[PDB]
Amino acid sequence: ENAAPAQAPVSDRAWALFRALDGKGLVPDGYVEGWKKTFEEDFSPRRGAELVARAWTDPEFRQLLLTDGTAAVAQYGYLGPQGEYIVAVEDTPTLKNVIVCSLCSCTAWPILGLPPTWYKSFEYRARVVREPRKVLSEMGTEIASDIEIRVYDTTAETRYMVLPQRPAGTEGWSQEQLQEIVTKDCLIGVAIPQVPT
Amino acid sequence: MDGVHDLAGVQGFGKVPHTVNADIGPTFHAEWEHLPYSLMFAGVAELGAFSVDEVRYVVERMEPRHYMMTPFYERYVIGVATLMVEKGILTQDELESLAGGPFPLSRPSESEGRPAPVETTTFEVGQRVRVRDEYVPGHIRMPAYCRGRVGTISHRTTEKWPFPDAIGHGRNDAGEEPTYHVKFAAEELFGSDTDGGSVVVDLFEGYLEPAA
Ligand SMILES: [Fe+3]
Ligand SMILES: [Mg+2]
Ligand SMILES: [Mg+2]
Ligand SMILES: [Mg+2]
Helix, strand or coil, X not given: CCCCCCCCCHHHHHHHHHHHHHCCCCCCCCHHHHHHHHHHHHCCHHHHHHHHHHHHHCHHHHHHHHHCHHHHHHHCCCCECCECCEEEEECECCEEEEEECCCCCXXXXXXXXXXXXXXXXXXXXXXXXXXHHHHHHHHCCCCCCXXXXXXXXXXXXXXXXXXXXXXXXXXXXXXXXXXXXXXXXHHHCCCCCCCCC | CCCCCCCCCCCCCCCCCCCCXXXXXXXXXXXXXXXXXXXXXXXXXXXXXXXXXXXXHHHHCCCHHHHHHCCHHHHHHHHHHHHXXXXXXXXXXXXXXXXXXXXXXXXXXXXXXXXXCCCCCCCCCCCEEEECCCCXXXXXXXXXXXXXXXXXXXXXXXXXXXXXXXXXXXXXXXXXXXXXXXXXXXXXHHCCCXXXXXXXXXXXHHHEXXXX
């Protein structure tokens, strides 16, 4: 009849899994709390923003980031789980890049942060590969006719970040000022960096 | 596995539930949500009981209606629990007793997997390749939209990894292969029914063959 199976509340199931393993000595002291702290406080799109601001103000670094993203990210010490082989993809006046994991949710965790609910949604996983212009427009980003959209589907171990175009009106800004307008959505590729008015 | 998780190109979904730069809230929206990834890492890195690939495949093995109605992090609670039962570490009885109620798991695998292919080709940037027209009932990191399609190599990785169709089943014969960024024209994948430009899929060597 297509009905859902009976299930205990998800909180009860998740803590049951913890307790079953912990009670057998298989979970080191502090282990899951340590991972929660890493996920919440260390893996962060502020890191990808720092890399973008550096590439925008340092041609040499920009070239390394686009040719050997792993090496560039390692200079900052930001390699990590789900972020060991990095490729940065460059937006240009004729090309807009967008990232997805259509099969699940794969994301460059250490430099983008853990993916948000919308990126893991069936709507984004199904639609952005086939109609990325319409998806971005609905999300609030208009990509003109004149620009190729290229969708990177994260299907193996490459973990991607978008290097967005640097917007007019930011000439001479410091790296801190530039970092501030590079958001998580800019790194995923669904947003373009915005300059206040 | 041609499961419901292979969602790219499915039609009928509505709007993505986000507008750009909207507040996404905290990393975890419930106090249990850090547990699936943390316990997965216990399994992978502290116990050596399973690979990340096995986690992807056990989630793919959720019964299809169950998958479609289950929020993301809960799918990984169910997947990690399932692997711990299948590996002999935990029992479903103890999980249900601790949980105070039903804890249905993913379905058993219907494939033993397959080894890393013995015959493959090293491709170079700019070469045209076709995705092998093959059907794999176990784990595979090839979305169906690119099966049999032709594209161009934009990158060969400088590292190699175990073949998912083997290591996602815990087999000993996953070997190692590089992967290739293969660029497809949108029209190659979806004909006239697309508004995009190109799609780049990151495909293991063993999924590819020379085109024509
Ligand atoms: Fe994923
Ligand atoms: Mg299918
Ligand atoms: Mg529910
Ligand atoms: Mg029973």
